[PDB]
A paper describes a structure:
Here we report the use of “Build and Retrieve” to define the composition of a raw human brain microsomal lysate. From this sample, we simultaneously identify and solve cryo-EM structures of five different brain enzymes whose functions affect neurotransmitter recycling, iron metabolism, glycolysis, axonal development, energy homeostasis, and retinoic acid biosynthesis. Collectively, the BaR approach was then used to reveal enzyme identities and solve cryo-EM structures of these brain enzymes with resolutions ranging between 2.69 and 3.40 Å. These enzymes were identified as [name] (GS), ferritin (FT), dihydropyrimidinase-related protein 2 (DPYSL2), glyceraldehyde 3-phosphate dehydrogenase (GAPDH), and retinaldehyde dehydrogenase 1 (ALDH1A1).
GS is a glutamine synthesizing enzyme engaged in the recycling of synaptically released glutamate and γ-aminobutyric acid (GABA) and the detoxification of ammonia. Subsequently, we were able to identify this protein as the GS enzyme and resolve its structure to a resolution of 2.73 Å. Human GS assembles as an oligomer of 10 subunits, creating a dimer of pentamers. The two pentamers stack against each other to form two layers. Each subunit of GS consists of a small N-terminal domain (residues 2–102) and a large C-terminal domain (residues 114–372). However, the loop residues (residues 149–157) of the C-terminal domain of each GS subunit are responsible for securing interactions between two pentameric layers. This catalytic site also contains several other positively charged residues, including R299, R319, R324, R340, and R341, that contribute to substrate binding. (i) In two unrelated cases, newborns were found to have congenital glutamine deficiency consisting of two-point mutations (R324C and R341C) on the GS enzyme.
Residue numbers in the entry:
A (entry chain F), B (entry chain G), C (entry chain B), D (entry chain A), E (entry chain E): 3 to 372
The structure:
């Protein structure tokens, strides 16, 4: 649908075929001032970097990305995680970088820095996270891909986990994204079509601590890039189409070594009790705009929790926190926080799960730790 | 967008697959009478040339390229640099050739010849150059690629270092160009999307002396050829679209062994003082038309230096010469001359940096040396 | 949408402008063997016919219209009613003709002949009828006009009696049909958009006895012809689109001089009691296929009576027979039989209302009268 | 852009040419349950109605228009005003009808009934009203007409009161609407292009009392119908396009005989003082959703009053109430309330101006009068 | 080419057919802050205005037209001239209005006010003016109408005064404009195709004094409006296409009663001598930007005077001022000033011809008169 997609791709492929030689390419990817966005730039490295630590720091213009004022626009990218590059193949890498200010203080959307400190405090207990990112592939026009033009597809029902031309739209984009994630090392755990047509879900898990955020952000970047080649645009909006068509939510699974260990459902239920008390804090933490975006998806209908009221159940698809029945039967496992929106920053959601359940924080403001 | 792009490219590829045998192809590339343009022609060589010196001299009709009068139209190409050919692969080569007149005097746009002499005088001090060529991919119609037809894209902001179908236009062309440069041996140091949509930057660094000009010219040639296959046209105009959309400028980094060496920021600042004094000379040297073109980009707005007034700062994105903060902290490094336009001849810009800073020249006219 | 519609209509108009002279054209229109269809043919008459009686009888091939076997295929058209011709203007006429068999016995779909006898028996009591024919304009593809392609329009709601490009589809066809009916002398009483998009209703009445059938059939013919010029196709199917989108039903209003006269609601309610007893007979009489077609529309949902169960109420939109509240308040008026399908033959519906309510018939078979 | 627009219009015109005869058509137009919408249906009248009183009452299904529950869905249309029909010409009429419930109580969106009572109380003082309705013509896709596809038109500036193909979009629709209003008798006082491209304003006035609302509603209906024929859709949304492009607001001019009479600016300023006190009441009254819609347009930028703060000035384009300088110089005249949104119900805005300024009401609830 | 042009025009025509009744429409047209532009708005007048004096003054927002600051944005339109309306026919009028500031001082682009005073001083001598406005019809894309796409038409030569599909482009627009001017009362004196393809010339003559400016401005407005209906855009740029294709210039003929009277060529030549002395003043007065625009057209090639050097000849097409040979033979007549650009404000050009030749002014600044 995009002009770029229309460009002959065979041509680009023959250039990709050419041996690149000793020089290696690293894409430096960083979160935007908006906080939902991702930006990227490429540098040439003389030799393949064995580890993320080896990769050099780089700088970018903050004013263009809306992360700083003109007077000291420069911002610094510090490599945080390194993944293989699906797009260019090995030795090329994709680097996720924390953004730092001109004065070397973590940037406003560098939520990894605070989250990383929080994960380190609770590293002994091995908190693990899984997330279930939901997205709709929408053409350049902004209307979902494959929907009739100036129209709506047939009644909702056949599209969930659908097969066939009519049932599923953008499977190729999904297939490419999934393989690209495997090649990159992003821990994709599976994919499924979603109830809304043209809407899919990709789940990353089980990552441990800060890794969850890194993997999801890289997965999202991979999705956007794969989508760009096809010409479609992935959207993480909580309610992509207004109406009865389903909204997109990123349901975070959370477990700790104690919960996973036998008779750990006591821990699962203790965590849930803490979550209920800080529900306002969680809703704000879980989406970039503080809950306006999350509220659109969370209408209390279409199997979504109401955003006003916290709820917990076992095998209750709708309630804000659902313990799977199997986890309950096993008396050990994980619970699924279903409040986070699709546009949620993973670092915030993980950090808030740790802060509320493991660090036992109380009150609206996040704690400051020595 | 071009008719040629519409031709089936698979067909051409099957011919490229055919083994070419012992014979080797050399593209002889030379600068136009206009001085911004590049022209090219191909010859068959019995065996692969090991070195540029081996390559034979060739001649071309100057009247067609607007480099000489009809009476003695013939001009001579002398191979100057040799690169591997990305388009046809090895053993084929791309040759950049100095243009000489019928009377064997360097041609008017053979600025390499004078520059090479200047580089040789200062070879002991190892001046190194980096440049940051900016360009906009524009369709055959002349309107930037991917912009709405008879329209303008959404407000400036999301496109800088952007990812996704909406944010970036012509990434495939950029990817192909970058790989082609690596294969050719052009020293590409990285690439980034630019603030304007459909505008990108490719940086060649760090080359030493005359090499900088050769690499950039070959890089530009590679870009034009890659663009031709896709059907888009790269433009190096200083202000490709008139209005608030950003102009394209080639910011030249300059260093010398002394500046690079510890406590070399004294040298960096001495060079800057000299640059300020010859600002008129630099502006004229830095663009083909003497500053009319450069002035359009350099309005003193959109983070560009005013073309009337020289300015210098540390980490001052806008000022004509910016020392990176990191270079200042290290007390050694390079400074970034930001006055040169995208259409600048690299040989002129390098030569003028040497002449002003290293040779300590004074006055409007360039010096004549024994 | 049809190829014929694409033909330049200005050209046809200049021929229509030409004076036709003394000769007059009469379109002879007759019901098909199927009974839902209408067919037509044109003859030239030396002078304008003042009355229907003057018009000459004509014959047609029954085998082509599926009304008789090959051995005695000829069938005879006897002019029954005459209307002015909207399409060609005066003096040209549209003639509705009863179809008679080769042996001069009324044809199987010549339901007017039996109905006319029934109306004549009850002529003293002046039964009047009103009908509300509903139809959907559907392109040559068979999908309703203006609906997205391979898609469905927005949720039902805004389209009923709608104004604006989005709300109403085929208003021009409706406007032309309405004016054509006025010119022809069809007693069109009004028009409204219907709940389903692209679906409209036209009301004919108040008519008297056999006239109701004649007017409706001519109105339908006019609609089909007007639609043909636009290229759309009108459909009288009971359930044009399968699903929650509304079906098309022709609700017959019925009154008699006694009911209309003050304190005539006793008569209205006596008629309704008789209607309830012969509900099976009515359902069969009211549609061509005996109730299979009617059943699709009459699901007992979307404000339609269930086809299995008779119901009567006052101002009960859904019940099979509704007395308007105003009629009830006035203690005189008409009741609305809502069981007849859009594809109903009017002659059958009127005849069955007379037979059940006025002639007080009992039993499945229609009575035979001396 | 709509499928209906693509249908040949010449054909419809030849049917319109046919003489319609004695029978006359009346379009009964009524406000929707939403309150922004308008719906319409047509009936045939034996003779032209000389006055609105002559026109018969009619009924419609409230459930389809979302004005009543299914049990007593019927609602009643009582003719309120009569206008000539531009679409079908004389003798045909357009009728604006108040909507009444099944129990004969004014419907929820029958705001004319309460307003009419209020106007009658103040009839002695002759309040006159003038409203500037603003609207954007937007294609079936929902993007404004003539804007580049998936794009934005050139910077705002040239389009206000513009001439030429580039400057003005949908002038034909505007021209047709204006003439149609004149023919109908709607008191159009002028038209101008608006700052946003594809956005126009049609001003109605000076009408007196209840007439103001009737004329505006009929004008809006005429606009929607004219737009439907062209295929475009008029929108009265307060902020049709989100961003710096201008929103659409219906600025109202209020005067009374006293204000108009010499040295009446004291009255103009007394009214303004009262308006300031009931600003919350006015904002709620002035738009259907209570101020959410109005707030989007009223950002306090682009020459619009902030919706949070009341402001008054003389010749202050931006302030909520502006007295024209000429009115101030004359010491007599009208003031312009600029708070009402484009989607405002006129009956509400007029009624609230009377209630606050003339009836001197105090408090959130509207008064109940014997 | 414009979307608006694609809208069915037959529909608009049927609305135009409707009788408009007693009310009359007046388009108030005024010059933009840029000074090349024209803007327009419509008002309803109860009765046809017999004279321009009768027409009411109106006001508009200066900030939108870039004529004043926000604090006192209001500007006032005072009707100056009245013409019949070709677009809506009689009684509707087109009004050209002088623009006045909030403080009632003539606006910056209200050059008529100063010019009118100058004409009045010399009214006794009856200066007459003729002008020859040249324009190119260019599609919405900005490339001249009928030129090949991304291409150039055949060599210049056949297009001047051409006939046939290949030779002339936009004759229909020209024909409509010419008739519209006749109907309006604009004094069109003729039309011819121009050397460049798609370029035409319309000449308004001979008007006296201030009338010349009024007629030309109204003619230009009529052209823009006629062009808008067709979808093309007229351009008055001095050099519409860069290259050898001809530029558009408005050659002003000037005469006075004395020059016209026998043996008046002495006066014609005295005026020319004065013109030569104030050549700098004339070049600045003759175009909006002070000569940058005029210089592009006036290259001293393609039969245009060089803008640097004044020249005068008899029957010398190229020289800045040409006396026609016939005028010279007659020893009486007019001379043709060929320096003014197509985008010239007529009021400025006339005023400067009067000031230099008739008022015998000397020096760069225009004189101030009691
Ligand atoms: Mn799940
Ligand atoms: Mn930089
Ligand atoms: Mn009904
Ligand atoms: Mn205003
Ligand atoms: Mn001439």
């Amino acid at each position: 649908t995009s002009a770029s997609s229309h460009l002959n791709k065979g041509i680009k492929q023959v250039y990709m075929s050419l041996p690149q030689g000793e020089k290696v390419q690293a894409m430096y990817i960083w979160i935007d001032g908006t906080g939902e966005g991702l930006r990227c730039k490429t540098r040439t490295l003389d030799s393949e970097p064995k580890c993320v630590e080896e990769l050099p720091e780089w700088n970018f213009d903050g004013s263009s990305t809306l992360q700083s004022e003109g007077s000291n626009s420069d911002m610094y990218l510090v490599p945080a995680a390194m993944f293989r590059d699906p797009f260019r193949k090995d030795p090329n890498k994709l680097v996720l970088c924390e953004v730092f200010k001109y004065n070397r203080r973590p940037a406003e959307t560098n939520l990894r820095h605070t989250c990383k400190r929080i994960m380190d405090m609770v590293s002994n207990q091995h908190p693990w996270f899984g997330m279930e990112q939901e997205y709709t592939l929408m053409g350049t026009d902004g209307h979902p891909f494959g929907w009739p033009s100036n129209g709506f597809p047939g009644p909702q029902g056949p599209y969930y986990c659908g097969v066939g031309a009519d049932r599923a739209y953008g499977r190729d984009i999904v297939e490419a994204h999934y393989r690209a994630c495997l090649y990159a090392g992003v821990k994709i755990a599976g994919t499924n079509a979603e109830v809304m047509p043209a809407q899919w879900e990709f789940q990353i898990g089980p990552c441990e601590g800060i890794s969850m955020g890194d993997h999801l952000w890289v997965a999202r970047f991979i999705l956007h890039r794969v989508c760009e080649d096809f010409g479609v645009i992935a959207t993480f909006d909580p309610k992509p189409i207004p109406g009865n068509w389903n909204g997109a939510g990123c349901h975070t699974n959370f477990s700790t070594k104690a919960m996973r260990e036998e008779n750990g459902l006591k821990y699962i239920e203790e965590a849930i009790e803490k979550l209920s008390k800080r529900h306002q804090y969680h809703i704000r933490a879980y989406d970039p705009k503080g809950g306006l975006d999350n509220a659109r998806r969370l209408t209390g209908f279409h199997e979504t929790s109401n955003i006003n009221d916290f709820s917990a159940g076992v095998a209750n698809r709708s309630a804000s926190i659902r313990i799977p029945r199997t986890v309950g039967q096993e008396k050990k496992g994980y619970f699924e926080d279903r409040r986070p929106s699709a546009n949620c920053d993973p670092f915030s959601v993980t950090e808030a799960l740790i802060r509320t359940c493991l660090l036992n924080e109380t009150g609206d403001e996040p704690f400051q730790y020595k």
